[PDB]
Design a protein around this ligand. Structure first.
Ligand SMILES: [Ca+2]
Length: 381
């Protein structure tokens, strides 16, 4: 399984050629507190492309966990603000057997009853005021799913872009798989928010992938090891065109990563790779990266920071391509080399999905706002 988060059921039609889109994100509010006593989840969609695009060719697809999807009645969102375009509906896709699927669709391009201005190629675009509306309140849905099951299998989502001219194949790199936060998620609140550059980032995400053994970067510097690796892609969506070199305060910043405590003894080497969001032909394949550091994590049993690590540099641009002065996104890649094959690891462990986090902090360990991402890797219960 080479799918993001090891997700077992999803569309895997293949890939289009690399196009000039660079970001697509789904950002739902946490399912906490009073949200549970209602029947809605609020969200926004972020999108960015680097060269003018047009037409109904480009279709955004949103997959939701089957356990939620069974109770979804309607999903709507506003297009990017501009010329008074109207609120959009995400249309549910059905199968050939008279059943709904857990995938919804809306056009990418605003002029084609979609979300994002085709001619705008600068700052990240927002489709605001998204609402998923359910048949029942979320407390009733959570009860039916079962608290135990919500603990062991996180509620997933996947957003991605397909191209009709390419037989609905996926635009590579323009996919994000995450999970809905709930009241069992507390780590984000262990972090104090920095006052430095607090309006420079819009969103952070972490995508995960199991990569095969013995693959490498083009230059040979980076690699996955004999048992493969779990790859964490920490992606930062900018608000405008941040330059670290010119504008960062509270320097030097730290790149931070946290891996599920259960996996720590099964991770050996940890590599940091520099990755680039290309203006043309966006490509973040493993081969494209370059190894920039050997990393550590906290391995002392019982330590408050168990499974966490961080790295800095007196010039952090040596480790991270910040796409300085550009609105393009940033990808920080962590390669977690496994000590044995994943199936042996799981056998030794024998359900709870594995959780990973990443964020940037200032020199005083305070979170750079909107740079925290969390992601998961699926484990069959
Ligand atoms: Ca699980």
């Amino acid at each position: 399984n080479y799918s993001a988060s090891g997700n077992t059921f999803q569309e895997n039609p293949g890939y289009t050629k690399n196009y000039n889109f660079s970001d697509l994100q789904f950002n739902p509010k946490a399912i906490t507190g009073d949200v549970l006593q209602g029947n809605t989840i609020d969200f926004e969609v972020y999108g960015k492309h680097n060269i003018a695009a047009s037409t109904a060719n480009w279709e955004i697809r949103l997959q939701l966990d089957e356990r939620l999807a069974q109770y979804v009645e309607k999903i709507q969102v506003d297009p990017k603000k501009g010329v008074g375009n109207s609120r959009r509906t995400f249309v549910r896709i059905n199968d050939s057997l008279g059943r709904p699927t857990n995938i919804w669709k809306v056009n990418y391009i605003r002029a084609n009853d979609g979300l994002f201005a085709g001619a705008e190629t600068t700052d990240t675009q927002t489709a605001p005021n998204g609402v998923i509306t359910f048949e029942k309140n979320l407390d009733e849905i959570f009860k039916e799913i079962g608290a135990d099951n919500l603990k062991s299998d996180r509620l997933m989502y996947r957003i991605y872009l397909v191209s009709h001219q390419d037989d609905d194949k996926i635009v590579p790199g323009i996919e994000s798989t995450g999970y809905f936060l709930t009241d069992q998620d507390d780590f984000y609140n262990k972090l104090d928010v920095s006052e430095n550059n607090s309006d420079q980032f819009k969103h952070g995400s972490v995508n995960t992938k199991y990569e095969e053994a013995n693959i490498q970067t083009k230059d040979g510097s980076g690699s996955t090891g004999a048992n493969g690796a779990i790859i964490l892609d920490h992606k930062l969506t900018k608000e405008k065109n941040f330059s670290y070199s010119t504008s960062a305060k509270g320097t030097p910043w730290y790149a931070n990563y946290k891996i599920d405590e259960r996996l720590v003894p099964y991770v050996s080497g940890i590599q940091m790779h520099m990755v680039q969001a290309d203006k043309v032909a966006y490509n973040v394949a493993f081969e494209s990266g370059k190894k920039v550091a050997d990393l550590a994590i906290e391995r002392r049993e019982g330590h408050e920071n168990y499974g966490m690590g961080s790295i800095t540099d007196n010039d952090l641009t040596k480790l991270i391509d910040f796409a300085n002065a550009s609105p393009r996104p940033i990808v920080v890649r962590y390669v977690l080399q496994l000590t044995k094959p994943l199936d042996e690891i799981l056998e030794e462990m024998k359900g709870e999905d594995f959780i990973f986090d990443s964020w940037l902090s200032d020199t005083n360990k305070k979170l750079i706002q909107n740079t925290y991402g969390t992601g998961y890797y699926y484990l069959q219960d």
